[PDB]
Design a protein around this nucleic acid. Structure first.
Lengths: 132, 155
RNA sequence: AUAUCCUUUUU
RNA sequence: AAAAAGGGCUUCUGUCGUGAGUGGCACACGUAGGGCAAUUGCUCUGCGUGCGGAAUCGACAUCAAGAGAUUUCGGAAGC
């Protein structure tokens, strides 16, 4: 059954909802409703060279939710442009960390507000090392 | 003629793997990736480049040697980090051959580069060092592979 | 070929 | 710090996949949080590893993305 997709496609034509790329999913539309209500904010994870893609999380989000926000974004962007789908992040997070402006994000279960990230802010990656 | 068993051998006389990374090397099978596009005989594999040199810096330096058709600087696809090697293609045999002899020792940044042809589709049995094996290596971690250009076989 | 072998007892 | 006695052998999930030894799913183990019962036990969800530790050397290594290796011995199964 796929009766929900017709109603979805009819809804995306609403000018207040034309921002979303058709395939919305309830979580992303909930994020947009929250940023309308003010408890959601976007954040930019910046590739050191090339481009900078932004992701959106809730105001109560911990590093876990930013982790799954990166999980969601680039995976879609792959076949949005036609890239590589089967991407193994048992590597990526085993080797590369997340870096605030200054500090690096280490405690995975701590909210982004404690580490100081806020709306429109940017984060980056270090290869970790620095012991083991 | 690549063979991961003798990669750890001082002169190709070893019969037992030097380490587990050779077991991993020969057990695993490799097929060239999707990004491998172009002629292999005219592709130059340049490595040891600084992580902060961009595509134009390589472009001018290796177009000094002839005509380029495509230059790719392999980055980490998720984080942007340059993987410190780049494949450069050359129209006509002239350029690649010249930039094989007068190519090692043309330091580009505060890092000295290494130059070789791309083997992948021309060297039978080539297993890149990510899936164990490979070539070269610093003889300090514990895993090196002789038989190449940086460290040839000590007879 | 660069670096570390492990257990028990006495002192 | 030094002396003596010494230190058996093998293996460590399946499934479909090839830009994917690194994915998806399932399973096993560990962890964190919630609920339930008699100081402890039972159940649910996320994450980590594919048997698990210690020491050492790197992680600024040659193939379109993939950092591990040597020595050592604990667990289970079979010799």
């Amino acid at each position: 059954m796929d009766v929900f997709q017709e109603g979805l496609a009819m809804v995306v034509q609403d000018p207040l909802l034309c921002d979303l790329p058709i395939q919305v999913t309830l979580e992303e539309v909930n994020s947009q409703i929250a940023l309308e209500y003010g408890q959601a904010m976007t954040v930019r994870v910046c590739k050191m060279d090339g481009e900078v893609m932004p992701v959106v999380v809730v105001q109560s989000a911990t590093v876990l939710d930013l982790k799954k926000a990166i999980q969601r974004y680039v995976q879609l962007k792959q076949e949005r442009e036609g890239g590589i789908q089967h991407i193994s992040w048992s590597y990526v997070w085993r080797t590369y960390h997340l870096t605030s402006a200054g500090e690096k994000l280490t405690e995975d279960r701590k909210k982004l507000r404690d580490y100081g990230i806020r709306n429109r802010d940017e984060v980056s990656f270090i290869k970790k090392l620095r012991q083991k | 003629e690549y063979d991961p068993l003798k990669a750890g051998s001082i002169d190709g006389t070893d019969e037992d793997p030097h380490d587990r990374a050779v077991w991993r090397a020969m057990l695993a099978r490799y097929v060239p990736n999707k990004g491998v596009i172009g002629d292999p005989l005219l592709t130059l594999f340049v490595a040891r480049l600084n992580l902060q040199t961009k595509e134009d810096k390589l472009k001018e330096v290796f177009s000094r040697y002839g005509d380029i058709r495509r230059l790719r600087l392999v980055r980490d696809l998720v984080t942007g980090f340059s993987k410190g090697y780049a494949f450069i293609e050359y129209k006509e045999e002239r350029a690649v051959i010249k930039a094989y002899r007068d190519a090692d020792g043309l330091v580009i940044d505060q890092h000295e580069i290494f130059v070789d042809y791309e083997l992948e589709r021309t060297l039978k049995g080539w297993i890149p060092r990510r899936l164990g094996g490979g070539l070269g290596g610093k003889k300090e971690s514990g895993q090196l592979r002789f038989g190449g250009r940086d460290r040839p076989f000590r007879k």
